[PDB]
Design a protein around this ligand. Structure first.
Ligand SMILES: C[C@@H](CO)CCOP(=O)(O)OP(=O)(O)O
Ligand SMILES: C[C@H](CO)CCOP(=O)(O)OP(=O)(O)O
Ligand SMILES: [Mg+2]
Ligand SMILES: [Mg+2]
Ligand SMILES: [Mn+2]
Ligand SMILES: [Mn+2]
Lengths: 176, 180
């Protein structure tokens, strides 16, 4: 498994092993972020396993990942939903297509990503992969947004950035 | 290091090495929890280190610990503030002396404690201890209380429980006053 390095423009220029790619000096690459809601309109929020290299133990939006060469964003989402959460989903829909960010985690591990954001509805029950998720909570978007507005530090930095993007917030608010 | 074992009532019966005491079947023991405010009245929120046996990587209030043999709870508070956060404090105030809590953490570790709660002001800069604390933030109490209300599952259960105790909460609020 790998990540896709991107030049100043979003042009793929090569790849790196996924583990070896996230360091104190992580280089720009391709990723995705996805927010999942069940049939009742609840948002799935997850807590990253303690073994994740970047932001271990941190509360975040439902599923995040790294598309592989030749893979569409939507397929990557479906893939990681299955892999991390054993869940089937409806076709992922665009909510923040130009999201990009760089941040540093408490141990100094950096993420540096072009990271289009999506949303989808689950169509099956979760089956948790504890190598990836250590905890999770089905909740009302509205409460999650309040939490994010009041104590952003309690959540991953990119979760906060996405939720406080005016357009992306409107679009998520329509999934409930 | 040890914990002080308490019987079915909060009466001490002996001691037990710290690590070995905290398992999936933790016996009742003495502990403390403290809420620290800077001069400006901001609350110090901290994140437990990933190496903590119980609730690693979790956001919680300022500092918690285990008094040792012959130690006042207040002394214990002063000591862990120094050890965990390197910080000097004013005399800790008792804000919830009867707090008691039992709970299992995300991997099955149990805390079962008599845990009086205190509040105090910091009087020095921080020197965070990375083997204890992996991250922190200085916050306005109102915000913290609003996040706890909106998403309580994102913080330690004992922070939520203490924060929603009416008397405790009013003490916390009193410490938000700016003090030179
Ligand atoms: C209320 C309990 C835990 O919730 C107090 C325990 O404090 P800890 O920090 O977990 O213990 P210690 O500081 O002694 O390692
Ligand atoms: C974190 C960037 C954007 O948020 C995407 C990567 O999310 P990860 O969960 O770290 O991806 P992976 O599951 O492949 O480890
Ligand atoms: Mg992921
Ligand atoms: Mg402690
Ligand atoms: Mn990445
Ligand atoms: Mn204990």
């Amino acid at each position: 498994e790998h990540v896709i390095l991107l030049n100043a423009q979003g042009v793929p220029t090569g790849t790196l092993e996924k583990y070896a790619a996230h360091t104190a000096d992580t280089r720009l690459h391709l990723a995705f972020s996805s927010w999942l809601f069940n049939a009742k309109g609840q948002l799935l929020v997850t807590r990253r396993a303690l073994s994740k290299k970047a932001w271990p133990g941190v509360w975040t939006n439902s599923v995040c990942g790294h598309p592989q060469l030749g893979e569409s964003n939507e397929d990557a989402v479906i893939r990681r939903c299955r892999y991390e959460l054993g869940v089937e989903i409806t076709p992922p829909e665009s909510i923040y297509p130009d999201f990009r960010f760089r941040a540093t985690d408490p141990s100094g591990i950096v993420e540096n990503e072009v990271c289009p954001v999506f949303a989808a509805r689950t169509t099956s029950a979760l089956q948790i992969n504890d190598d990836e998720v250590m905890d999770y909570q089905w909740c009302d978007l509205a409460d999650v947004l309040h939490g994010i507005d009041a104590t952003p530090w309690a959540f991953s930095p990119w979760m906060v950035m996405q939720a406080t993007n005016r357009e992306a917030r409107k679009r998520l608010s329509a999934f409930t």
